[PDB]
Amino acid sequence: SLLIGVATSSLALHAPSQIVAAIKSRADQLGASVVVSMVERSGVEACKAAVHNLLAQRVSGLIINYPLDDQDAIAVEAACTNVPALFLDVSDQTPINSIIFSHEDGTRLGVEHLVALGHQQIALLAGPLSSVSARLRLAGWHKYLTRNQIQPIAEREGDWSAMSGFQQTMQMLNEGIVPTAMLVANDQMALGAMRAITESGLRVGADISVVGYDDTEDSSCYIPPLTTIKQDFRLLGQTSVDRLLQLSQGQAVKGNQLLPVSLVKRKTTLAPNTQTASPRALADSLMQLARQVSRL
Amino acid sequence: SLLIGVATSSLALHAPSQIVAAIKSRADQLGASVVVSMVERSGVEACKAAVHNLLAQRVSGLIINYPLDDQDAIAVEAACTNVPALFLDVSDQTPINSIIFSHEDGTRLGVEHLVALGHQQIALLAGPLSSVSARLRLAGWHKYLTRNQIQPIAEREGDWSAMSGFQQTMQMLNEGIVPTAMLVANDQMALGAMRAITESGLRVGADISVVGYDDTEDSSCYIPPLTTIKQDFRLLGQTSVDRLLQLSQGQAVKGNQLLPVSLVKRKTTLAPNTQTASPRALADSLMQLARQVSRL
Amino acid sequence: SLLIGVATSSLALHAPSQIVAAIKSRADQLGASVVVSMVERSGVEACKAAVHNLLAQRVSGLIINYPLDDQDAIAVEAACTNVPALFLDVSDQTPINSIIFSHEDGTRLGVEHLVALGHQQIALLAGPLSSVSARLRLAGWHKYLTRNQIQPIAEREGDWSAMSGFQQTMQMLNEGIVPTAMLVANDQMALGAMRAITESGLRVGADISVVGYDDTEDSSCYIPPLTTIKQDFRLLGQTSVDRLLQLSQGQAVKGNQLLPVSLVKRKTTLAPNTQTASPRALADSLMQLARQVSRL
Amino acid sequence: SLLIGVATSSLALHAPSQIVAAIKSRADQLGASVVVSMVERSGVEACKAAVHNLLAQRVSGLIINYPLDDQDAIAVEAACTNVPALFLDVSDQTPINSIIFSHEDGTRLGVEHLVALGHQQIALLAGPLSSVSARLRLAGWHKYLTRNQIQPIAEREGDWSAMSGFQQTMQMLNEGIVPTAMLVANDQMALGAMRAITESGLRVGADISVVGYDDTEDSSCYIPPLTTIKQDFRLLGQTSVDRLLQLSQGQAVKGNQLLPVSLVKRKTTLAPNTQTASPRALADSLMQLARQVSRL
């Protein structure tokens, strides 16, 4: 019935795909409908052209799941010709209709957790700094780390992908920076970091703890199971469809809304390794590896 | 410029999102437009609805990446009415315009890799048999297993997700059926499967070997890196868009088309009952220790 | 005398700086004058404003050293209101006044060299694909690689920086992709590639061969020295000033001018032939290191 | 908005090209425009000729990034005819508006680092002595060098390029003089010095240690990475543009602003006679050892 138009950022990432899917899930309940358009991933203009396409579609309202800086947020919004526009990837400080997850709680649950566990040397692996959310999370980790008087020994950013956690986390360790813990921007890059740690002959949990962010499906699995900050994209899905519907149907709601968020503890977190293999230990292993090579 | 309508499976699953993203990219370079509609895992009617919603938006042509039984594929093509449709998930035998990967080489490369390593006790983990592709790959492991004189000790089916791979493998092992290798319908279920092996105290590769399907993004980065049958969805993307346009210009090929496939061997595969390592493995172990010494 | 305007790509890069300094040498001998205007690396528009800045500069002639995709080349041409326009970073096939190097030869001398030593596993490190020249050279590697029935085991692209060469090469190796040789699209990136290779306890030339493109001032005396495709920028400059003067002097110069390009053999290229040593021998070597490690 | 004229020395050297780039980024932000004019190594007159060219180019203000002794600096300024001018390559004691980095810090930091390591045999590779910065640094090396009772066994002067560092160093070594640490006027030369050192069986860091100046882009990719005094050219570009527009406004500043300098420690430095060690060394051996093993 009520045609919904969604400007979504690359569905290649799991969160968006799970969000769009939720949107479709709820829409079907209200007998509504969703038509999806994928922003070219390049800021306002790309975002704006998508919306323009959506309007030409007979779109009743719009849900804009795409990372928009303030200035660009009001713009795209101003572009939505009297059509109710709800934004899912902005700042809770933007004067537009939005529903977003608590970025304060999320960044808090993570630090507090790692601290309550005894981690001192912690590293940050942020999402691309082009994204609102990423920067908003990097900020949280800084507000609460210093609150607990902690200073990140290393910080760096990927692009939300597994291979990025692997790229960044490999480069770091090489630099001889080995935190006892890592606070990651999302689960995917987290999978990447857990991949780079084992690659480095370290254990996850046991040597270097990793906290994700999102709780995208696959994460209950992952080896070992990823402790992360769950964001219910089923909630963000219904809440936003419903709101967009109200907004559509003159039910003035206007502002920004913040969603719960939570800490799902699993196995990538233990705290923190006191020891490390000594030259003696490495030489030993090397001995038998030598022997084995000899045998060949 | 023009409009390409894609009717796609749940974008919650990674191959669907990667195909659609690839579709978007080729379209991007040719100035076309992509508008995606999503179908409820129900079949024909659910798929028909989506075709309709797209037809109600010009849509120069449709790309239908939704599994359809040969009979329901015809029925669905018949509803596009004068609009060119290209099916990406059907049997290579349905009288429609299709582009599907070689399931015969996929399944053969899987079985031949396992058997040649020496695996006798092999279990199959198939996707929902409500999916043609699932059925195709399943029936294919049978063809090639049978002709290598092998019979699977276990045959199980999930639903494309990582949890299903986990819950199936788990209850398989807990039933006393423990294979030395597993052939899985997709990379996500491969992950859920690895997850369970290790959950039961076994080693992936050394103890239960695992073979995925797709080589979706995150499969490397898995611990250990997933060995798998790679299905270039970047190819599926451009090939799909180009031909779709040819269709909307009378320059159609009209028939079914087969895309290649290849075994990306990584580290979830090993000879059974292996005592003592191999050359490459000694290098891997060595390099880890080296990285471990570097940080010294 | 004659005020010459150079709208140039990033001076931070070496080639552009050498081309601009070369230009200045001629200008000073032919009593000309040069005014450089930098482009902000944003395609046609960014490129146009520069031209606009130059024309408004009483520019008696224009040399556009900026990668301009054919449509945009003609477009910037149109922008050159009544002033001869000589382009330097375009394709061989665009009806405009261009003086460009022969990429067919550059790509061929490179590929033919690496294939002659016995390399089979060759990876590419293209420049940014938004560049015409990056795209021409990349193509040639293909056109010739296939000729000698060889296909890259990797392909990637950087941004013309030594860091992107490092990062991208480091990334290719970090994922187990390790060819016998590399074809790099410029020497700045060649530097990082060498740095990355070494950084991975790998030997340049001996283990991984590298072939850069350009021959900037530093390549001779890089470590080891770099065998690279020679593009004479002292020639480019003189040809541009001379022809720009003539072209404004009334002379009928008109079209494209393909400049030579050769191969500079130095110390970053050797034949492949791997020599394994004995499991006994290597084993012993390891045991050595073991003691060396235990001592520390 | 307004237009900034830049009189730059050869854009063939990296520091200059980097400074200009930084200037452009800043202006861009403040909406200012930039027209570049290149100077010949001739001095006073060539520079004056540059300035007059720009005055004729309208120009709201000029940034003079060219080398001038006190007298030439004052001549050049007087040639600027009222238009605000800022000098970046002068003596911090010249009565003109400038912003030069601190050479006292660079030279002190340099010699202290080599003595802390225990070096006794320190040679000096100064820049062209026509350069106030080149002379200042050489003098600086001499103040803290003699201040530390140490006397340079050798002292030579190149000309800012890699090939001249090589030349002077090959000469030095060739004459029998073979230090154990070297202080070089800039990194390009440092590279050449490092090339010569390898050219002669010697090793950088281990055998002949090397310290450069500038920390220009490519320096962290040199093999081995270069230890060097980092001059922040972004800080130098924005502080200069800001100051020029301000200076333009008639808002006082008048004197000179000494910018900070620091020492980036990398892998071209080591204490003299080293009694065998290095975790990365052994680790590097392991990495190379681990490769023959893989191929075993």
Ligand SMILES: CC(C)S[C@@H]1O[C@H](CO)[C@H](O)[C@H](O)[C@H]1O
């Ligand atoms: C509602 C979003 C801000 S969640 C956000 O989306 C990103 C894509 O833009 C990535 O997938 C991040 O991992 C995810 O946390």
Ligand SMILES: CC(C)S[C@@H]1O[C@H](CO)[C@H](O)[C@H](O)[C@H]1O
């Ligand atoms: C062309 C398709 C059969 S790819 C197929 O899609 C499925 C969804 O139906 C799953 O995601 C599988 O992993 C994937 O291989």
Ligand SMILES: CC(C)S[C@@H]1O[C@H](CO)[C@H](O)[C@H](O)[C@H]1O
């Ligand atoms: C005139 C070009 C083809 S030379 C080209 O310029 C690029 C920047 O534009 C990079 O510097 C490359 O290394 C160089 O080959």
Ligand SMILES: CC(C)S[C@@H]1O[C@H](CO)[C@H](O)[C@H](O)[C@H]1O
């Ligand atoms: C602001 C300057 C003193 S930087 C100075 O410029 C020189 C050219 O004049 C060389 O490029 C040196 O490497 C650099 O230190």
Ligand code: EMC
């Ligand atoms: C808490 C979800 Hg293999």
Ligand code: EMC
């Ligand atoms: C197959 C795109 Hg740790």
Ligand code: EMC
């Ligand atoms: C090609 C001769 Hg530091």
Ligand code: EMC
């Ligand atoms: C940052 C030490 Hg190509």
